[PDB]
Design a binder for this molecule. Structure first.
Ligand SMILES: Nc1ncnc2c1ncn2[C@@H]1O[C@H](COP(=O)(O)OP(=O)(O)O)[C@@H](O)[C@H]1O
Ligand SMILES: Nc1ncnc2c1ncn2[C@@H]1O[C@H](COP(=O)(O)OP(=O)(O)O)[C@@H](O)[C@H]1O
Lengths: 449, 67, 102, 443
């Protein structure tokens, strides 16, 4: 609903033959790059490949991020699209190569069938039974709970292990509540009071709920979408048991941890059981590392090994820089800001500047996307920027000009409202002239160097 | 009753025209309103448009009087 | 043919197996009158259309269901599933108490 | 499966004649690099022989000359018999622990303690479980189990009845019981009882009954690394840190105790020590402090063989301001023998591309393989290998059964090689942001 930089991008706008239509799905031009991004979408949808690298290479404002977000739409919702900047990699909690691995495994998805095996009913009896322990000093302990559950078409009496009674107890269950119990986790949920004895005169603000229909014991099945990283995190910070470690692990502050290769390898074994059991579909996705020049030579040297993994997502890099110094390696210059031995691994999609008539088309697509109804002379005005000034400066003027027109009582933007927008809101270059002319000498009114 | 709400349109307009008659009969005296919850952008729309054009054919085939 | 079957039933000798013909031949056998003429003491019906769009859950059901048209077209099955989600998505998949993947 | 096609998936071993260490011109997915493969096979021999401790080998050569491939070939030709640790040198720059501690843990991971143990396992189909649960529970109960060859009934002790009820063991369930622990694993449901499993969904699998005796001794050969023993001894659930990480810096006196105890188990004959390999990929990412530690870690008796790869020429050593070959200090390089990988000839590129075109499901027409070979000479082995996947996807878009020259040409046109990418950069220097931060956005 809110309008943002890429709201007009809907897809790559390719033909079924995989050729780009010159203006489609919000794009203008970049046709060769849109066609290359199509073949990458094909590489992703065909699950066969791991750890292929793609670089979107081209100057700022050439639509590299529009291409990546268009890929994210051609893949649809099922496939994991995992966007990061290279500046997200420098965590204070864990080494930066941990964050890369977390993002690599966040980019691999799993759809898995799960059977939830549960008991549900109105609690009709609850009777604890206990033993006098030998002198451990903590005193007597509950040995078991007997609990009666009533549903609409049956009842049970359950003799619980005391670890499930602790779930029952920490859930503050009472006689006459409706509860849900998972035999999977031993976990308990208090659903409400019965709709029996639902007298209004409680301060307790209870939700009275109907008796569960059907039998007390149920075995429902549901399909869960998870990433491999979701499994890593669950098993590294255990929280689904009723044991003391799972209990205290919910009270401690959450913190990220440098999950070992040993854990990740053994979760591959676990997930492959789900595949062989036929309960899971593996759905590998894509990791988009925007601003990949902000990675350092330790990140890039780790990506070597990470991409060689027998499962890894597709990695799409974007860079906007020429021959530049590699970060963390001030001795080494290379194109794109990428180490030369890593660049060998990638397929590079070069991305090119727009022509003046393409800029005019983009301005009109963008104007009608923002709902800025805009006269043709006004379009020509805005499209003379983008040629003389960055393309982004065109698109950013459309909103001020709309406000100024509406404040002038116009239904639509004239050249006048842009000519006022051009004056209130400068580009970087006009502002850079103001600096150099005013900071031409120091003083009270100078800009600070 | 004085109000009929169709949660669903039927493929046959005669059945809904019968259904909405239940309130609109010689014993009625309040105004009758009929509401029809056509969910927009769905085949609930095409079902209603097909049923509505059939009612025109059924009215054309009774162009001449039966009186 | 559904009009013939009624006419065959009442008068099977004549009607054993264009509008200017129909309205003449049926003049004896059908009598019809309408509330506009004889029962105009009643008001007319007010028919109000009440459009509402698919909620975000319904359209998640509906669009993933419509995705099957990329493979099939079963269409008479799909138009019943489409009618379910257009009524309430709990008809198609009942929402129920849920928890993370274990 | 969960293993997808990856860059090294075609490597099945080292491709060397085990009787002579003569490298075959191609086998097991390796092509050429014969002298390097022979040397890696001599290293592989003395790894398996175990008698030699803490030697370090560097594999040195230009990028894409098969350095990782040879490392993967050794790993595939050691298999499970020997520990094999792979370390990217970037990994030791932990925030949890100092880099010498991280580098210690990597050495400890590469020595295995091999421990052989037995247990009686009882396995069969449950014919019946009777449990009285007589107010309290677990009072008494009887278990009947059969194989195809025997049937027996057992009176159960009360803590076994708890185990049976905990596992909801049911008639028809195929179970194994480890007797000394008393854990019950339900291996499956017997097919003959399928109709009793009225709660199980149709997705449920079934099995035939177990065969032979209900009870036998099954012998397990565990291998546990010195690192695992170190971490186990750190805290009350130390092993739990082998997964999450969150090991601290493990105290040196814990390791020194463990080294003594493992020497006792060896002398007592209770355990064997199995020296593995640590492979340090792109070792030049280590700094001068790391190399100083490695120098003496290699002199330990419980040191693995360390194998290393470097792309680097005479290059700046990290953490200092002078240059040395491989980017490695000469005092460290004095402790290391070096294996060189050379560039490939055009026919070896053709063979590697052919192998890669077998590992992916691709049919190359003979002219498409010739063109990819030509692109391989001109643009590098890795780029032509990525054109294989691209061409198949283009061919499938035109519904072709085989990849033709037209598909390779589309690939070459759509995706630039590194040199054309650099040339594109060298032309676009005003539009690309320079090292000065300067850029022009105008047309
Ligand atoms: N070919 C195109 N068609 C339509 N809009 C485009 C195109 N290329 C870029 N844009 C738009 O121009 C703006 C700047 O492009 P952007 O993707 O931010 O460039 P980069 O990410 O390379 O700096 C964005 O709002 C983007 O949607
Ligand atoms: N001799 C060889 N036989 C088979 N495949 C090879 C050979 N050399 C390299 N390759 C393959 O080509 C790719 C690049 O080689 P690689 O071993 O990664 O070189 P480096 O590690 O030195 O960059 C890898 O996928 C590798 O499997």
């Amino acid at each position: 609903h809110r309008t943002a930089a890429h709201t007009h991008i809907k897809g790559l706008g390719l033909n079924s033959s995989g050729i780009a239509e010159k203006q489609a799905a919000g794009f203008v031009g970049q046709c060769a790059a849109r066609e290359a991004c199509g073949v990458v979408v094909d590489l992703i949808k065909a699950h066969k490949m791991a750890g292929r690298g793609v670089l979107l290479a081209g100057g700022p404002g050439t639509g590299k991020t529009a291409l990546a977000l268009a890929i994210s739409q051609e893949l649809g919702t099922k496939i994991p699209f995992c966007p990061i900047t290279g500046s997200e990699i420098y965590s204070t909690e864990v080494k930066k190569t941990e964050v890369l691995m977390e993002n690599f495994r966040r980019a691999i998805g799993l759809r898995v069938r799960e059977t939830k095996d549960v008991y549900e009913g109105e609690v009709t009896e609850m009777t604890p039974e206990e033993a006098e322990n030998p002198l451990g000093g903590y005193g007597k302990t509950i040995s078991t709970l007997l609990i009666g559950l009533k549903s609409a078409r049956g009842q049970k009496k359950l003799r619980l292990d005391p670890s499930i009674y602790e779930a029952i107890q920490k859930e503050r269950v009472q006689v006459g509540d409706v509860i849900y119990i998972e035999t999977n986790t031993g976990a308990c949920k208090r659903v409400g009071r019965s709709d029996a004895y639902a007298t209004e005169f409680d301060l307790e603000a209870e939700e009275y709920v109907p008796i569960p229909k059907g039998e007390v014991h149920k075995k429902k099945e549901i399909v869960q979408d998870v990433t491999l990283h979701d499994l890593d995190v669950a098993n590294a910070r255990p929280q689904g048991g009723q044991d003391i470690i799972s209990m205290m692990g919910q009270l401690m502050k959450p913190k990220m941890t440098e999950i070992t290769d040993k854990l990740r390898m053994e979760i591959n074994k676990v997930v492959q059981k789900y595949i062989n059991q036929g309960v899971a579909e593996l759905i590998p996705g894509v990791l988009f590392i925007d601003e990949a020049h902000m990675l350092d030579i330790e990140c890039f040297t780790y990506l070597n090994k990470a991409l060689e993994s027998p499962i890894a997502p597709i990695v799409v890099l974007a860079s906007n820089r020429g021959i530049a110094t590699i970060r963390g390696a001030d001795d080494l210059k290379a194109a794109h800001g990428i180490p030369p031995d890593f660049l060998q691994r990638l397929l590079i999609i070069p991305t090119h500047p727009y022509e003046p008539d393409e800029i005019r088309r983009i301005v009109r697509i963008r104007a009608q996307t923002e709902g800025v109804q805009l006269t043709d002379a006004a379009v020509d005005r805005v499209a003379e920027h983008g040629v003389r000034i960055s393309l982004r400066y065109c698109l950013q003027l459309l909103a001020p000009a709309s406000i100024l027109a509406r404040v002038n009582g116009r239904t639509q933007v004239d050249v006048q409202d842009i000519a006022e927008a051009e004056e209130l809101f400068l580009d970087a270059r006009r502002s850079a002239n103001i600096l150099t002319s005013t900071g031409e000498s120091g003083g009270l009114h100078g800009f600070i160097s | 009753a004085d109000t009929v709400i169709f949660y669903d349109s039927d493929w046959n307009p005669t059945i809904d025209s019968q259904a909405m008659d239940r309130a609109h009969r010689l014993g009625q005296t309040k105004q009758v309103t009929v509401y029809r919850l056509i969910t927009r952008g769905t085949i609930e729309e095409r079902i209603r448009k097909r049923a509505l054009q059939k009612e025109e054919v059924q009215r054309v085939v009774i162009t001449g009087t039966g009186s | 043919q559904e009009l013939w079957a009624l006419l065959h039933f009442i008068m099977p000798s004549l009607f054993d197996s264009q509008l200017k013909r129909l309205h003449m031949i049926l003049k004896p056998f059908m009598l019809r009158r309408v509330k506009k003429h004889v029962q105009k003491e009643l008001g007319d019906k007010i028919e109000i259309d009440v459009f509402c769009e698919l909620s975000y859950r319904q359209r998640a059901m509906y669009q993933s269901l419509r995705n099957q048209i990329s493979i099939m077209d079963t269409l008479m099955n799909l138009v019943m599933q489409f009618r379910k989600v257009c009524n309430h998505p709990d008809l198609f998949e009942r929402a129920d108490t849920s928890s993370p993947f274990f | 499966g969960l293993n997808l096609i990856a860059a090294h998936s075609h490597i099945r071993g080292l491709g060397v004649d085990a009787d002579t260490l003569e490298p075959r011109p191609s086998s097991q997915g390796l092509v050429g690099q014969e002298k390097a493969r022979k040397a890696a096979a001599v290293v592989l021999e003395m790894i398996k022989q175990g008698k030699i401790a803490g030697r370090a080998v560097l594999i040195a050569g230009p990028p894409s000359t098969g350095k990782t491939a040879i490392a993967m070939g050794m790993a595939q030709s050691l298999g499970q018999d020997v520990p094999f640790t792979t370390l990217a040198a970037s990994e030791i720059f932990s925030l949890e622990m100092s880099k010498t501690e991280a580098l210690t843990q990597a050495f400890r991971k590469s020595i295995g303690v091999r421990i052989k143990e037995e247990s009686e396992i009882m396995e069969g189909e449950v014919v019946e479980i009777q449990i009285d649960r007589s107010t309290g529970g677990a009072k008494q109960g009887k278990l009947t189990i059969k194989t195809t060859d025997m049937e027996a009934i057992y009176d159960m002790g009360s803590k076994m009845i708890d185990a049976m009820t905990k596992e909801r063991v049911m008639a028809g369930d195929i179970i194994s019981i480890d007797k000394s622990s008393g854990k019950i694993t339900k291996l499956g449901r017997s097919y003959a009882r399928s109709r009793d499993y009225d709660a199980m969904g149709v997705d449920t699998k079934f099995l035939q009954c177990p065969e032979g005796e209900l009870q036998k001794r099954k012998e397990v050969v565990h291998t546990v690394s010195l690192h695992e023993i170190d971490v186990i001894n750190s805290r009350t659930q130390g092993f739990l840190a082998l997964f999450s990480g969150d090991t601290g810096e493990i105290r040196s006196e814990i390791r020194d105790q463990i080294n003594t105890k493992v020497a006792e188990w060896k002398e007592e004959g209770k355990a064997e020590i199995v020296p593995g390999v640590l492979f340090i990929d792109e070792v030049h990412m280590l700094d001068i402090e790391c190399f100083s530690y490695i120098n003496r870690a290699l002199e330990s008796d419980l040191a693995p063989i360390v194998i290393m790869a470097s792309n680097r020429g005479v290059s700046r050593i990290r953490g200092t301001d002078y240059k040395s070959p491989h980017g490695l200090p000469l005092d460290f390089l004095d402790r290391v023998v070096i294996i060189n990988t050379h560039p490939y000839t055009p026919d070896e590129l053709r063979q590697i591309l052919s192998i890669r075109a077998q590992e992916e499901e691709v049919d190359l027409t003979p002219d498409a393989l010739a063109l990819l070979t030509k692109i391989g000479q001109e643009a590098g082995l890795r780029y032509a290998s990525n054109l294989i996947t691209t061409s198949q996807l283009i061919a499938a878009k035109r519904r072709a059964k085989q990849v033709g020259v037209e598909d390779v040409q589309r690939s070459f046109k759509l995706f630039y090689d590194p040199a054309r990418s650099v040339r594109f950069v060298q032309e676009s220097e005003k539009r690309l942001i320079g090292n000065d931060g300067v850029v022009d956005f105008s047309y």
